[PDB]
Amino acid sequence: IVEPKFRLSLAELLDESKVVPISVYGDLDVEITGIQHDSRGVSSGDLFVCCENEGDSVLSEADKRGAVAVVASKEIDIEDTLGCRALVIVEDTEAVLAALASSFYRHPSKNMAVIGVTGTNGKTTTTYLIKSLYEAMGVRTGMFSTVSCYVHGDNKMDSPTTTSPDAVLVQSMMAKMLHNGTEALVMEASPQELASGKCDEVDFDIAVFTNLTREDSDFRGTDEEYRDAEAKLFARMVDPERHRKVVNIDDPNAAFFVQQGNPDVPVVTFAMENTKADVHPLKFELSLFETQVLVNTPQGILEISSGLLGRHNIYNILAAVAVGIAVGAPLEDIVRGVEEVDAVPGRCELIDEEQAFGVIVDHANTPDGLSRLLDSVRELKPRRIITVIGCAGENERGKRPVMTKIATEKSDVTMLTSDNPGNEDPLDILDDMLSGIGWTMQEYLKHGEHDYYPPLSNGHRLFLHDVRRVAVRCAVAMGEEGDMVVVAGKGHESYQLEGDKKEFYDDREECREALQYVDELHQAGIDTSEFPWRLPESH
């Protein structure tokens, strides 16, 4: 991947961005080769933007790393503490930050087709499906997702491990795709990013609305503010000739979004249950390994066989179909693009190694995320559900008993383990989890001495192990014909934080490697139906 080079003077950058400074000090002709807001990422020749929440030590760090000009909301004594050649004072640094990044990178979003997907659920899988849909038509398509970032095809970018990319970063990578030949792009438009104004300078072409449910406890706002934040993307649907709208009409809110923006913009409706939608399924079949759906579209009917699981993924397929319908895509490109996508990482990702039970890895780490995930697995009609779940340490202490009660009431077998202990002892977190069903670590360990763990009041089984690698692989070894093993918590994350070091750990690899070697364990006489294992030489 080729790194673009940008060179703009400070005077030109302000003039292009239309930012009116309160006061300017130093030299306005200083050449700027980069823009940064985090001091640890500032390089020599970069323009530093100081947010209101970063103190005086941050400014020195940016200056030490070679910042040549600084933008901040408050007056700073340049003459004795800063070696920077210029300083810009603005009323609001956060609002100006988006404008500065877009002007510096020359508004790359104006040279591509930008498709923004907003909603509480389905943003990542729909973004993965739509990118494949555009690629099936031969368009070099990039992607901005919570999981991954691509320039086009399989060319993965080394994305920083930040759940919400900043406004500078979004503009920075977006121009990189342009320099490398990207023609279209699909980005997730999360409510937090839309509310924060990070995506304010993105020229969206098509806005897709999936659904809205109050799930994100991280959102610092009311339900109306959460709803209006997503409406920002639909508010920009102004040009009828260029812009398109795709809405899920099963949501009661959907009417609110359709009224947003220019009412003359074309709208394509998709629904699983409402047959009044333009794009809707006629019949579908769900199994542990695949879904098959017959979808009625304004241009005809389509047959789709997808590796994605659950009925919530049918909506994501329909949204990709409707977006293909909206752009007038060839029906055959719609089917090929959808069927090409097999596993978006960490989103109910099926781990297939030609075995008789399904293994899915998901990022669900909340009581309501786990409840929704286990209800989607149950509708696939497995014989048993085996869930591997843990809780993060030093934070979110209130969900520990809650997630155990949910797992034990919806899963036939539950295996508690460690998700991210940090500096907390893993057996202390597991004691907090055990309290949600009336158990304690001491009682569980007593049952281990008698080599027998009794079931719960509902007849389900609970097992425990503080080593995640052991607990994940032991749960795969408990799988039988027609079961489902759900490894929740981490999803696509590739680190297990113990103490302070972020040891490399991938849940997908552990499930993949356990499936390979489960055969030799069973022919060696080991009975792994439950805890404890029965070796041939044990009685």
Partner: protein
């Protein structure tokens, strides 16, 4: 005196009062070139050293001198406990305060077949080593895990109820009763003192000051030699050689 040896002047002090290893003299704190403390040479009569054992070894006083203290505290016959130290045995489920998932228990004279190939391969070797010494262990280290994990208050209650049951009910009942009284007496003393029962297994070996060993030196050499050999390999046969040598140094003729 050889550097870092049994007579080293880093560890035990100068052999000449006020004279360092390099020969620099001062009137009676550490030399910059060698590190000798400029003190009286009499400190070699009182300065201790120690040997860092790669593998823990049981103290021969508390294992072999009948009646055995470790065997009485663990309620295991010295025969089944001596093979864990000097024979090719292995003890399953040494600990009870951490999760386990195998139905093994007790002393295994042979080796578990599946534990050799299938289990290490299924969990990978790097991931297997983390929880390996929690399902089945071997050597004196296994004994130390049992001692460290003992619930001394459970021992007293279990011994008392078993003692009373035998009373309700000829050379074995009386002998078993004396065993139970000794065990509960032993547990009580640990509770009310600051002595930990796991200290009966040595992790470090204190070394006598050189002036008191101007036999013992050769015994120290053997312990260091085998202990240095064992850390180069990192086996069970070498652990026995280290453990046996420490037994010879501490108490021969046992």
């Amino acid at each position: 005196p050889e550097k870092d040896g049994l007579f080293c002047e880093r560890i035990f002090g100068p052999i000449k009062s006020g004279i360092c290893a390099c020969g620099n003299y001062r009137v009676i704190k550490f030399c910059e070139q060698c590190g000798v403390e400029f003190v009286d040479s009499r400190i070699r009569r009182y300065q201790m050293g120690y040997i860092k054992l790669t593998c823990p070894v049981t103290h021969v006083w508390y294992l072999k001198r009948l009646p055995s203290y470790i065997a009485n505290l663990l309620d295991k016959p010295l025969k089944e406990l001596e093979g864990l130290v000097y024979c090719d045995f292995s003890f399953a489920r040494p600990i009870t305060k951490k999760p386990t998932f195998l139905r093994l228990r007790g002393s295994f004279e042979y080796e578990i077949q599946s534990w050799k190939y299938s289990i290490p391969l299924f969990f990978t070797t790097q991931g297997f080593e983390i929880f390996r010494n929690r399902e089945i262990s071997t050597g004196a280290g296994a004994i130390r895990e049992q001692l460290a994990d003992l619930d001394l208050r459970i021992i007293i209650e279990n011994s008392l109820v078993e003692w009373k049951q035998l009373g309700e009910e000829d050379r074995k009942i009386v002998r078993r009763k004396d065993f139970l009284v000794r065990r509960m007496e032993l547990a009580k003393h640990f509770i009310r003192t600051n002595i930990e029962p796991e200290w009966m297994v040595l992790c470090l070996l204190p070394v006598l000051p050189p002036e008191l060993r101007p036999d013992i030196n050769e015994l120290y050499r053997r312990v260091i030699y085998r202990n240095n050999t064992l850390t180069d390999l990192l086996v069970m046969c070498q652990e026995k050689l280290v453990q046996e040598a420490v037994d010879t140094l501490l108490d021969n003729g046992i």
